[PDB]
Amino acid sequence: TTNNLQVTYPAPVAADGWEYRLISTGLTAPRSIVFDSTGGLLVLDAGVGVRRLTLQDNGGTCLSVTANATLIADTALNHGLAISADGGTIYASTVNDVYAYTYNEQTNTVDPTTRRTVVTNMTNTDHVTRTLLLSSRLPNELLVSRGSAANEDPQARNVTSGHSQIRAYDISTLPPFDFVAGTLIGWGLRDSVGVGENPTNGGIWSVENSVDDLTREGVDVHQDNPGEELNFHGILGNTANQGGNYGYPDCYALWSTAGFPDLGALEVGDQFASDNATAGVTDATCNTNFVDPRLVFQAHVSPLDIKFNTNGTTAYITFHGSTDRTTPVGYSIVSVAFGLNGQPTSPMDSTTAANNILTSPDLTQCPDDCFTPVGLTFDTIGRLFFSSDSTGEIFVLQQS
Ligand SMILES: *[C@@H]1O[C@H](CO)[C@@H](O[C@@H]2O[C@H](CO)[C@@H](O[C@@H]3O[C@H](CO)[C@@H](O)[C@H](O)[C@@H]3O)[C@H](O)[C@H]2NC(C)=O)[C@H](O)[C@H]1NC(C)=O
Ligand SMILES: *[C@@H]1O[C@H](CO)[C@@H](O[C@@H]2O[C@H](CO)[C@@H](O)[C@H](O)[C@H]2NC(C)=O)[C@H](O)[C@H]1NC(C)=O
Ligand SMILES: *[C@@H]1O[C@H](CO)[C@@H](O)[C@H](O)[C@H]1NC(C)=O
Ligand SMILES: *[C@@H]1O[C@H](CO)[C@@H](O)[C@H](O)[C@H]1NC(C)=O
Ligand SMILES: *[C@@H]1O[C@H](CO)[C@@H](O)[C@H](O)[C@H]1NC(C)=O
Ligand SMILES: [Ca+2]
């Protein structure tokens, strides 16, 4: 490599058979990342806009950033970033709007005047990120995620508010869509920041940042509950397993049974009534009217992205890390094994489905001396790249 970048905190530990390298540093707050057609890495640097890193590639993890330009300067862009399959359009989001920009791959420039607003009316308080995903199987379909306005948001009970949900938009048909004009992929999703497509079948998957301060029969159980969730939303362009309500704010998934008041026949993975559920809602109601997660993960690990490998055998998820637990959790990259039907190989009650790929050597140091993984992407040869927003870093990760 050109440069020898090193981390400034006790370094991530790779599982056996993996290796990594830090390749960019001094970014402000890097969120979503994607490759352009010319081998450049586009970085949604929150509060700055979209930056393009030029990389030199000597094979394996031997990559070096040789240059960087700001393609789009806009301080409102806070997370979401996508690029068309032909490479000629960039989509990026603010709290309120999803913009499309023409991207000139001959120059590697974007003319600001080319900006059009494709989706709008998304603004709300608290969860302000708007994850963008373009389908591979249906390349005209743009998915957009949008969280709650508060930890327990009552407007998430009203589907027309557009809070706590994922929408799909046919961009080929485009005066922006209104947020709630899109096909409904899911609602009752508090903050499903990570959304991905499994190539095995085009199955749509999201990962949930579930509720804080969880009380159960008035007892505080927030330390180990509720679960973070892997949720399944069917395939794009069909309604099976899609558009349902995944619980929030009425129902939450169970991670840890021990010391859980009013367990009943509840198992790991099953949802239960929130103490603050609307008048009438019970556990049976959670069981019959709301869509359960397909897997759960350790409470508060805070997943932010999910990406599958070319073959669909494995998904990789970023765990950005807990902020409210006495002993912190997350601060890792994990993988989840998937089968031929495009479902996880683990049962929905498993507590061991997340396999560690890259971890913080000592959780007691986090957040302050730990990476906080956010964005993931694959290059053309299957190498995995990821962002760490709080340390201003980009890493490459691969099997050795
Ligand atoms: C259901 O709704 C209730 C009511 O909003 C939520 O209760 C909140 O629980 C937290 C405990 O984590 C309370 O915070 C604490 O308040 C006391 C004062 O009594 C203070 O000494 C503590 O340091 C802490 O700030 C919070 O006040 C309470 N909120 C209220 C009464 O407004 C509960 O978390 C919700 N249940 C869920 C999300 O499962
Ligand atoms: C993007 O490019 C700029 C231009 O080279 C880099 O800015 C230099 O950064 C180093 C940081 O150690 C300074 O010593 C130089 O003075 C900077 N030069 C200028 C002209 O500002 C910047 O580091 C690059 N950023 C990333 C994230 O790669
Ligand atoms: C539902 O959502 C829309 C939000 O725009 C609003 O017009 C309506 O009054 C809301 N409340 C309901 C149906 O309870
Ligand atoms: C946003 O919603 C408001 C209603 O509050 C409406 O005036 C406006 O037409 C919407 N914008 C678009 C582009 O749909
Ligand atoms: C798919 O991807 C991974 C990485 O190449 C590999 O370990 C796995 O064996 C592959 N599966 C199939 C069915 O080819
Ligand atoms: Ca749920």
With vertex at residue 26, the alpha carbon angle to CA 23 and CA 31, rounded to the nearest 5 degrees, is 80
How are strands ordered across the β-sheet holding 89-93?
A: 81-83, 89-93, 98-102, 116-120, 177-178
What residue's CA is closest to ligand 5, atom 8? 313
What resolution in angstroms does the PDB record give? Answer: 2.1
Structure determination technique employed? X-ray
Count of beta carbons in the 10 Å neighbourhood of residue 280: 8
Q: How many CA atoms lie within 13 A of 128 on its CB side?
A: 9
Q: What tokens were used for 38?
A: 């010319």
Q: How many CA atoms lie within 13 A of 249 on its CB side?
A: 23
Q: Going along 156-227, which residue ranges are E strands?
A: 165-170, 177-178, 183-187, 194-197, 203-208, 215-216, 219-220
Find out whether 106 is annotated in a ligand binding site: no
Q: Which residues contact 390 (CB under 8 A, 6 or more apart)?
A: 29, 367, 371, 372
In Å, what is the CA distance from 17 to each residue of 82, 210, 251, 303? 30, 32, 39, 23
Find out whether 210 is annotated in a ligand binding site: yes
Q: Which residues contact 352 (CB under 8 A, 6 or more apart)?
A: 346
H-state helical runs in 345-399:
none
- 157 CB under 6 A from ligand 3? no
Pocket probe mutation, ligand 4, options 97, 178, 179, 180, max atoms within 8 Å of Cβ: 178
Pairing assessment for the beta strands 295-297 and 303-308 based on DSSP bridges: unpaired
Q: What are the φ/ψ torsions at residue 283 (nearest 5 degrees)?
A: -65, -45
As a whole number of Å, the end-to-end CA separation of the chain is 17
H-state helical runs in the chain:
283-289
Count of beta carbons in the 10 Å neighbourhood of residue 117: 14
CA dihedral 363, 368, 374, 380 (to 10 degrees): -80
What DSSP line would sit under 275-322, residue for residue?
Answer: TTPPTT--HHHHHHHSPPPSEEE-TT--EEEEEE-TTSSEEEEEE---
| Cα separation, 96 vs 163, whole angstroms | 12
Q: What tokens were used for 356?
A: 């560690």
- Domain 13-399 CATH class label: mainly beta
Count of beta carbons in the 10 Å neighbourhood of residue 291: 21
CA dihedral 35, 310, 357, 20 (to 10 degrees): -40
What residue's CA is closest to ligand 3, atom 5? 161
Find out whether 393 is annotated in a ligand binding site: no
* Distance of CA 229 from the midpoint of ligand 4 (Å): 32
Asked whether the beta carbons of 135 and 179 are under 8 A apart, the reply is no
Asked whether the beta carbons of 186 and 168 are under 8 A apart, the reply is no
